[PDB]
């Protein structure tokens, strides 16, 4: 349903903003792996969380 999709989109953005605020929850070791294709680290973690 459109309601479930929208809920996932908004909630996940809030989570992804909180984890990267101040000291990130994920070390730079994974960020290098997730950004190997040039994708921004914030976008890389969000796609992996999906």
Helices 41-49 and 2-19, packing angle to 10 deg: 130
Residue number with CB closer to another protein (1 or 27):
1
Cα–Cα distance for residue pair 15/10, rounded to 1 Å:
9
| 5 touches another protein (CB under 8 A) | yes
Q: Per CB under 8 A, does 9 bind another protein?
A: no
Tell me phi and psi for residue 32, to 5 degrees.
-65, -40
Which two structure tokens, joined as six digits, stand for 18? 């909180």
Cβ 3 to another protein, closest distance in Å? 8
| Minimum distance of another protein from residue 2's CB (angstroms) | 4
The residues that touch another protein, with contacts defined as CB under 8 A, are 1-3, 5
């Amino acid at each position: 349903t459109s309601g479930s999709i929208i809920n996932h989109a908004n909630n996940l953005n809030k989570v992804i903003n909180h984890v990267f605020a101040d000291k990130p929850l994920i070390s730079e070791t994974m960020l290098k792996i997730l950004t190997i294709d040039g994708t921004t680290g914030k976008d890389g973690y969000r796609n992996w969380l999906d």
